[PDB]
């Protein structure tokens, strides 16, 4: 209900505690790559999580934010309420943004 055909994700993806706007449908992709993410927490104990939207460029992004680059990844969070990680990327693979499906809603 979630994955299209193709593979990307058939509904758009939101922070699962206000609602924001993460993804648009069918602008990134099904990924069940093994990423550790902490426990979702206010910006400033965890989940190896293996279900993930898998973005190419955080312009594509509706809208999210990233915390401090701490050794080499940065923790993807709710733009608006702050509330995560809801994703993970390593700065070394530029083109490669990870949001955990169980840390966020879709509509
Ligand atoms: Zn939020």
Known sequence: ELVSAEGRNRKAVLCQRCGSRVLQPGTALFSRRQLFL???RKK????VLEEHWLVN??????NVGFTKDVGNVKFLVCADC???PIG???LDD???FYVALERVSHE
């Open 38 to 40: 902490p426990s979702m």
């Open 44 to 47: 400033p104990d965890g989940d």
């Open 57 to 62: 460029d955080m312009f594509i992004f509706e």
């Open 82 to 84: 702050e509330i995560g």
């Open 88 to 90: 993970w990327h390593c």
């Open 94 to 96: 530029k083109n490669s």
